[PDB]
Each structure stands twice: as C-alpha cells, then as structure tokens.
Design a binder for this molecule. Structure first.
Ligand SMILES: Nc1nc2c(ncn2[C@@H]2O[C@H](COP(=O)(O)OP(=O)(O)NP(=O)(O)O)[C@@H](O)[C@H]2O)c(=O)[nH]1
Ligand SMILES: [Mg+2]
Ligand SMILES: [Mg+2]
Length: 154
C-alpha cells in the first residue's frame, strides 16, 4: 500500500488545467486539444508514491490544490481569489496544501499578469508561486511534486 496524494486542479476555463495534467501524466501536449481522475506512480524524494489528479472543468476529498490561472489573462488571475476562498471554506482548513500556478509562460509576449503581481498575492496567501508551460514542459513536474511535498507534510 503506497501513499496516495490527492491533487485537485482548479482555475478558470482555458487556463490549462487539462494540458498541465496531460503533460505531467503522459508527456504529451497537443495545442487546441479539449479533453475524461488520473493516477500515476512516481518517486517522491526516494519514496514511491501514487498521485491522483482530479482535472475538473473550470473537491472535498482533495488533499492539495493547484490554483491555476493564465499569465495571458488577468481575468483568470482575478478569479483565483474566489477559488481560494471557496477551497478554504469547503475544506474548512486554512492551511490546506495550495500552490498558485501561472500557466502558459511560453506566451510571454501576451502576458497580462506580471510576476511581481502574482508573487504579491502568493505571499499574501503564504503560498508559493510557480510559472509553468504545458507546451515547453517548464516547471510542470515541479508544481505537482512540490504540491505533493506540501501534502506529505500535513
Ligand atoms: N501555448 C500554450 N498553450 C497552452 C498551455 N496550456 C494550455 N494551453 C492551451 O490552452 C487551451 C486551453 O487549455 P486546457 O488545458 O483545455 O484548459 P482548461 O483549464 O483545462 N479548460 P476547461 O476548464 O474548460 O476544462 C488549449 O488550446 C491548450 O492547448 C501552455 O502552457 N502554453
Ligand atoms: Mg479542462
Ligand atoms: Mg518565462
């Protein structure tokens, strides 16, 4: 019986929740692909564990949350506040494993949310901010592993 870390993908429509999930799961990225709980056995810091990712459309059983927004849409960034508030209430826990993810970092020329703005919010919530790209793979494994580490340590 291996540890099972339950991760939940949250965020506005189109931010890349599915793309991130599929890149992490199968190392595949197909632009314009609109997809089905995904499971995968991985080694976290020397320990084989199982990660379970719930990729919902833009929640109580979840142990950790990846709060995703697109750096190219400030609207999706603004929306993270509601998602944040909703998670804490439903989960009743204020220190729930949470990570703010700014996806689509490869679309820098279309950025609407600066790194400093996102970081400010992350610091305000006492969580980390990581920018990812399902397309270039940049930091995708990092956000899932980092979140599992959060879950691992309560
Ligand atoms: N260039 C680029 N495109 C991305 C990235 N992540 C996702 N996309 C693209 O953005 C679009 C929406 O991604 P998708 O994963 O479907 O978003 P979602 O958050 O899962 N949408 P929904 O909430 O409706 O389920 C797709 O055409 C996808 O290829 C990224 O990092 N870079
Ligand atoms: Mg999706
Ligand atoms: Mg960059």
């Amino acid at each position: 019986s291996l540890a099972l870390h339950k991760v939940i993908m949250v965020g506005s429509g189109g931010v890349g929740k599915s793309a991130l999930t599929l890149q992490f799961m199968y190392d595949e990225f197909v632009e314009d692909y609109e997809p089905k709980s995904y499971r995968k056995k991985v080694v976290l810091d020397g320990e084989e564990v199982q990660i379970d990712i719930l990729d919902t459309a833009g929640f109580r059983s979840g142990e950790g949350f990846l709060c995703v927004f697109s750096i190219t849409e400030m609207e999706s960034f603004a929306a993270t506040a509601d998602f944040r508030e909703q998670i804490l209430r439903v989960k009743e826990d204020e220190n729930v494993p949470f990570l703010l993810v700014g996806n689509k970092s490869d679309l820098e020329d279309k950025r609407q949310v600066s790194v400093e703005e996102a970081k400010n919010r992350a610091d305000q919530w006492n969580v980390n901010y990581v920018e990812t790209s399902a397309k270039t793979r940049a930091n995708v494994d990092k956000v899932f592993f980092d979140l599992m580490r959060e879950i691992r340590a309560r």
